[PDB]
Amino acid sequence: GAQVSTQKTGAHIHYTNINYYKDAASNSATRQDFAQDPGKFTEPVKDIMIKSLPALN
Amino acid sequence: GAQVSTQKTGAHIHYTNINYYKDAASNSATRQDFAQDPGKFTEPVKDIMIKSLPALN
Amino acid sequence: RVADTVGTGPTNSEAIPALTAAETGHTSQVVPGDTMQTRHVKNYHSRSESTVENFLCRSACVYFTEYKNSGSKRYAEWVVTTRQAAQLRRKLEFFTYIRFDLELTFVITSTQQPSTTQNQDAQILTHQIMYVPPGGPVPDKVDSYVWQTSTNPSVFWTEGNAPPRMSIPFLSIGNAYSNFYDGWSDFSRDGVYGINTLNSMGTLYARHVNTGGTGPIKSTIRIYFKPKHVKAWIPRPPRLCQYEKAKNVNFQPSGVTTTRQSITAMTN
Amino acid sequence: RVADTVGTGPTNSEAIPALTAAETGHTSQVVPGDTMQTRHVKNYHSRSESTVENFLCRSACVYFTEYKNSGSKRYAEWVVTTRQAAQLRRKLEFFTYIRFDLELTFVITSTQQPSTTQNQDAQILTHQIMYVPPGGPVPDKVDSYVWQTSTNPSVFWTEGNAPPRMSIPFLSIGNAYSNFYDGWSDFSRDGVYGINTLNSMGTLYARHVNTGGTGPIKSTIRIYFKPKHVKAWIPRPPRLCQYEKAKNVNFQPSGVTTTRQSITAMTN
Amino acid sequence: ASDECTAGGFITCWYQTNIVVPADAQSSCYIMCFVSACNDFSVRLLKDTPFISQENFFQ
Amino acid sequence: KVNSMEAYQIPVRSNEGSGTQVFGFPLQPGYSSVFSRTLLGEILNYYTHWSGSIKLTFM
Amino acid sequence: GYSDRVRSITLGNSTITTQECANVVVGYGVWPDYLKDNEATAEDQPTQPDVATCRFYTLDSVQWQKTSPGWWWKLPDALSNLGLFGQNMQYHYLGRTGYTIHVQCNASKFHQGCLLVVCVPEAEMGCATLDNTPSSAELLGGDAAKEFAGEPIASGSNKLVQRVVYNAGMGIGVGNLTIFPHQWINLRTNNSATIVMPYTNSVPMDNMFRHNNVTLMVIPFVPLDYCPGSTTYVPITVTIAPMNAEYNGLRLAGHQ
Amino acid sequence: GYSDRVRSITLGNSTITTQECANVVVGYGVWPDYLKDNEATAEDQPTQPDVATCRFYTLDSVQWQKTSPGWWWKLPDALSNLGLFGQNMQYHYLGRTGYTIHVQCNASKFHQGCLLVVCVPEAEMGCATLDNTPSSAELLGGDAAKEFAGEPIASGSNKLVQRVVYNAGMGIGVGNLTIFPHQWINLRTNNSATIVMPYTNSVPMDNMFRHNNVTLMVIPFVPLDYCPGSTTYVPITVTIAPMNAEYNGLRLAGHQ
Ligand SMILES: CCCCCCCCCCCCCCCC(=O)O
Ligand SMILES: CCCCCCCCCCCCCCCC(=O)O
Structure with missing residues (x-):
């Protein structure tokens, strides 16, 4: 059961990976996980604030 | 995802290549890129000149 | 992929993007275009090296110890702790809670030690590393039954080839590893206080399997840690201080920053 | 594939292929057939070794340095520069702008150094190479914290097997590497002038991980560079001069060519 | 790391107008400054940090 | 001032003439002493290259 | 119409009303909630005292002086002897709860x-002596505020928390405390600060007496200062309300 | 919601933000605009420096005293040596441009x-001596404010602008200056005044150095007055931004 994935390349090409162990802890790291969400740390406050309105009214 | 390409042979035969890395910078060199265009360096001038016409008229 | 700026044109308006309140604690989020006229620029830049996994997916040497083929100190024992190396400790400290698989590489180098004995002949040394879980009997001498390792994971290495490598599953009684614990070992609150209270990862023992030659040989074993499959939560500020012990966060007091000659001056 | 000549027959005509103007600067492009009668010949010749990638896809030794297991000079440091080797420098100079991935092979050879000490025993030496980005702390001594390499790429090699090999992604602040820069480091224009201004590729450090024997050992590390995925623009004439420094293009003045006895003579 | 080739810029503050206060209000006040990465901000070539160093392994 | 909480505070006062300069600091976050120890600066000390806009907030 | 500044919070039989407030902050964007059955390690049914435990509790006020380094409270210790909530934890081996924090300071327009x-979360203070861990009495103050010291603790060979303000006791820069959830009270713009905290911990439930989850800290970046004849005493009051408090492991009272 | 008083104007790389302002005034209800082809006398293409010329420029501030007759600026002269805009006019024979005017004064509630x-438009000052026209140095101040005099210029036989405040230098009543576009700054009600001017002139384009189109004048109808111990220095700052500036007649630099 071979898996085909994209490679890390520049902008302005696939690598085959096969698991040979069943421990699942013997796999490679998940380097390609480019997801971010600053909503927790920034804009923590309950009532939402618009970009251009008086902050306190 | 194996890729099959032609080999370098004489005139007057395929090699299999598989990428085992995702960095994409770990791939082999692109030796077989036989494209040339002297138009930049030779015949630089704007107005095109025919092979057998007086050069200046 | 990084967000790309939007082109803007001059306007006079009731709306006030630049004006905001610090007191709310909602960080202001204003683009360059709101403050000044800008031009449409596309960005191909990628936030692909800031990922927590990329930042923490590199081998670092947590600790090294020395043992002798002859003399009183036959074998070396090290308790398994992340804190004793500053670089590994500082990056782990960046998150309060971390969950991660561990990759271990051991590098062993043997140096001949000068001696009065002569015409020494040296057969290739073989080195045994054995890891004991809490409550496993400790070896008391190098020739002990504990060295059989029937119930204990163990690796044998012959000098002159690739360093031995193993993968470790996430081991914790807890759902996540705790970089900082604000707690006492007992209910009374009289006793040791600190992260050392949640510290029970076991101990590692290294010995010469065999002695090649009469002369004394000293072997150094270096242990390397590489986080894998990393998961983080509750981020913490940068430590900003030199470390003092691996059992506590006690610190000599430190100035906030290096000092420039004057508020106006651009020179550090 | 090379262009193949077309057969031609005698003719008298107004048209003048051989006649042309040098002043326009458009290189004349006339086949042999226009100047003389020719025969139809097919060419199987291929322009497949003139490609820039084939020309620059071969390992060359940019530089080598020596470090000692004992004595004051424990480790060797080399700043990473293409210019210090003439053959590598000359071919790179052929294009003003070049973009290319870098392949690095390190070959390490250790030679025993004669000494007064006797009955030496030598365990296999292990060698560590560590690359530091600009502003990474430099090691001041061989036993420094800098040698942990938690944030720094590093390779460990055991003597007696294939040389260590790594691939490097195209590293530049700029879109392309600049072989020549006509510029000053500062706005004033008083200061160092040259390509050295755009030179910030970091530094490489090599040390003995361990000492096998009491006697002195000297190790030479040789660094080899192989361009990959090459892309070139703005081609430059052949250098035509012996080099003098790696920081400037300063040259002793050179005659145009070797001299024959007379314009008529066919002997060099 | 500071580079001769690339100089980031100079940031400075000036009084557009004199500060004005009523009698019984303090003439002198204070201003705090907060610094952050924008949405377009990015980084590369991760390296060991200069500030953290150990003479010996800690105990 | 670094030893006290006065490091963060920037002094301002009513003055006879308008146009006096409140303060001046280097633009780069990583090398400058003023931004080296901040959240963004500390993360930057870890990485060799940096890109994009910086937001400065004054209360 | 309505005002963003005006607010009214009602928990149990206690209601809080401030004419002026900065927008309320939820620290990680998560409201406090009761534990899931899927995530629950303990088999025994939990006991939920509901409104009894979940009410505002007012602590002893402190005096803001022109030179006060800082005031800090260990929150679990703060409510350890207050009402039914103090009684329930003493009775039970395991407790998990959300916390509502409300800090109120009142000053004249002229004050600054x-x-x-x-x-x-998990602030660990570090002892002034390197070889000794900090004492429990120094670490936690029950019924009384613990105060930061502008100067570093002097050289000593005894248990003693390191209280220098810039390190904040954690040996970390005071300015970077922004990453932790926080709210600024400026006398010209804000009367009081409200922070709501989701329960945070690696384990789903933990014994409250042995372990403290979060620590409320107040520090003045800008010193209090006023012209002569203005009120010279300023009072800061901390009110804390438990949220969705639940208890397990019914046990005989007291800790040892 | 929004406030009528709050405003934010962004021109080029300069942004102006005032918490309190009187409604902005367009003097004849006409926005400044580039010249029409139908109306254009000159055949040659014009050069439009765009954002370079069109940015706010801040002038030297003045001190408002309890007895200041008045301050007045010739606007074309004011920006004659400032940035690219000063350079473009020196280079070009003909220039036509709109002007944005922003006058900012800050005072305590107690101040009045x-x-x-x-x-x-076209204010012509009249010399104190009847037989002599006013001198250029007296008429226009470059990089510095020119000040009205409460008393009439004394008897003289020399060039000298007549500066008496009631006549305003135009020999016309000060009170009737209402017909000209204007905005009142009252310390209790207004922080600053914004006036936007359409280009005004009989000719479509005129040489800037020889001829000045409009003159900004500030006069206090009510004197500044305050109780003792209040800030005794008040600063008035004039910021001017060119609008839709265009240039023609590329010529060697300087005027003669
Ligand atoms: C068989 C030889 C190798 C034995 C390895 C034993 C398992 C070691 C696991 C260490 C994990 C450290 C996690 C971070 C620090 C901590 O939470 O204690
Ligand atoms: C981990 C050990 C290897 C470290 C390699 C570091 C990267 C070296 C890159 C050198 C590129 C040279 C490019 C041509 C010359 C120049 O433009 O400066």
Whole structure:
């Protein structure tokens, strides 16, 4: 059961990976996980604030 | 995802290549890129000149 | 992929993007275009090296110890702790809670030690590393039954080839590893206080399997840690201080920053 | 594939292929057939070794340095520069702008150094190479914290097997590497002038991980560079001069060519 | 790391107008400054940090 | 001032003439002493290259 | 119409009403909630005292002086002897709860001062002596505020928390406390600060007496200062309300 | 919601933000605009420096005293040596441009004063001596404010502008300056005044150095006055931004 994935390349090409162990802890790291969400740390406050309105009214 | 390409042979035969890395910078060199265009360096001038016409008229 | 700026044109308006309140604690989020006229620029830049996994997916040497083929100190024992190396400790400290698989590489180098004995002949040394879980009997001498390792994971290495490598599953009684614990070992609150209270990862023992030659040989074993499959939560500020012990966060007091000659001056 | 000549027959005509103007600067492009009668010949010749990638896809030794297991000079440091080797420098100079991935092979050879000490025993030496980005702390001594390499790429090699090999992604602040820069480091224009201004590729450090024997050992590390995925623009004439420094293009003045006895003579 | 080739810029503050206060209000006040990465901000070539160093392994 | 909480505070006062300069600091976050120890600066000390806009907030 | 500044919070039989407030902050964007069955390690049914435990509790006020380094409270210790909530934890081996924090300071328009109200998970204070861990009495104050010291603790060979303000006791820069959820009280713009905290911990439930989850800290970045004849005493009051409090492991009272 | 008083104007790389302002005034209800082809006398293409010329420029501030007759600026002269805009006019024979005027004064609630900010097309000042026209140095101040005099210029036989405040130098009543576009700054009600001017002139384009189109004048109808111990220095700052500036007649630099 071979898996085909994209490679890390520049902008302005696939690598085959096969698991040979069943421990699942013997796999490679998940380097390609480019997801971010600053909503927790920034804009923590309950009532939402618009970009251009008086902050306190 | 194996890729099959032609080999370098004489005139007057395929090699299999598989990428085992995702960095994409770990791939082999692109030796077989036989494209040339002297138009930049030779015949630089704007107005095109025919092979057998007086050069200046 | 990084967000790309939007082109803007001059306007006079009731709306006030630049004006905001610090007191709310909602960080202001204003683009360059709101403050000044800008031009449409596309960005191909990628936030692909800031990922927590990329930042923490590199081998670092947590600790090294020395043992002798002859003399009183036959074998070396090290308790398994992340804190004793500053670089590994500082990056782990960046998150309060971390969950991660561990990759271990051991590098062993043997140096001949000068001696009065002569015409020494040296057969290739073989080195045994054995890891004991809490409550496993400790070896008391190098020739002990504990060295059989029937119930204990163990690796044998012959000098002159690739360093031995193993993968470790996430081991914790807890759902996540705790970089900082604000707690006492007992209910009374009289006793040791600190992260050392949640510290029970076991101990590692290294010995010469065999002695090649009469002369004394000293072997150094270096242990390397590489986080894998990393998961983080509750981020913490940068430590900003030199470390003092691996059992506590006690610190000599430190100035906030290096000092420039004057508020106006651009020179550090 | 090379262009193949077309057969031609005698003719008298107004048209003048051989006649042309040098002043326009458009290189004349006339086949042999226009100047003389020719025969139809097919060419199987291929322009497949003139490609820039084939020309620059071969390992060359940019530089080598020596470090000692004992004595004051424990480790060797080399700043990473293409210019210090003439053959590598000359071919790179052929294009003003070049973009290319870098392949690095390190070959390490250790030679025993004669000494007064006797009955030496030598365990296999292990060698560590560590690359530091600009502003990474430099090691001041061989036993420094800098040698942990938690944030720094590093390779460990055991003597007696294939040389260590790594691939490097195209590293530049700029879109392309600049072989020549006509510029000053500062706005004033008083200061160092040259390509050295755009030179910030970091530094490489090599040390003995361990000492096998009491006697002195000297190790030479040789660094080899192989361009990959090459892309070139703005081609430059052949250098035509012996080099003098790696920081400037300063040259002793050179005659145009070797001299024959007379314009008529066919002997060099 | 500071580079001769690339100089980031100079940031400075000036009084557009004199500060004005009523009698019984303090003439002198204070201003705090907060610094952050924008949405377009990015980084590369991760390296060991200069500030953290150990003479010996800690105990 | 670094030893006290006065490091963060920037002094301002009513003055006879308008146009006096409140303060001046280097633009780069990583090398400058003023931004080296901040959240963004500390993360930057870890990485060799940096890109994009910086937001400065004054209360 | 309505005002963003005006607010009214009602928990149990206690209601809080401030004419002026900065927008309320939820620290990680998560409301406190009761534990899931899927995530629950303990088999025994939990006991939920509901409104009894979940009410505002007012602590002893402190005096803001022109030279006060700082004031800090260990929150679990703060409510350890207050009402049914103090009684339930003493009775039960395991407790998990959300916490509502409300810090109120009142001053005249002429007054000028800025206080930083930050709640920090797992803050570990470090002892002034390197070879000794900090004492429990120094670490936690029951019924009384514990105060930061502007100067570093002097050289000593005894248990003693290191209280220097810039390190904040954690040996970390005071300015970077922004990453922890926080709310700024500026006398010209804000009357009081409200922070709501989701329960945070690696384990789903933990014994409250042995372990403290979060620590409320107040530090003045800008000193209080006023012209002569103005009120010279300023009072800061901390009110804390438990949220969705639940208890397990019914046991005989007291800790040892 | 929004406030009528709050405003934010962004021109080029300069942004102006005032918490309190009187409604902005367009003097004849006409926005400044580039010249029409139908109306254009000159055949040669014009050069439009765009954002370079069109940015706010800040002038030297003045001190409002309890007895200041008045301050007045010739606007074309004011920006004659400032940035690219000063350079373009020196290079070019003909220039036509719109002008944005922003006058900012800050005072404590206790302070009381009223300033009249009026822009007047073709103001011609009259010399104190009847037989002599006014001198250029007296008529226009470059990089510096020119000040009205409460008393009439004394008897003289020399060039000298007549500066008496009631005549305003035009020999016309000060009160009737209302017909010219204007905005009142009252310390209790207004922080600053914004006036936007359409280009005004008989000819479509005119040489800037020889001829000045409009003159900004500030006069206090009500004197500044305050109780003792209040800030005794008040600063008035004039910021001017060119609008839709265009240039023609590329010529060697300087005027003669
Ligand atoms: C068989 C030889 C190797 C034995 C390895 C034993 C398992 C070691 C696991 C260490 C994990 C450290 C996690 C971070 C620090 C901590 O939470 O204690
Ligand atoms: C981990 C050990 C290897 C470290 C390699 C570091 C990267 C070296 C890159 C050198 C590129 C040279 C490019 C041509 C010359 C120049 O433009 O400066």
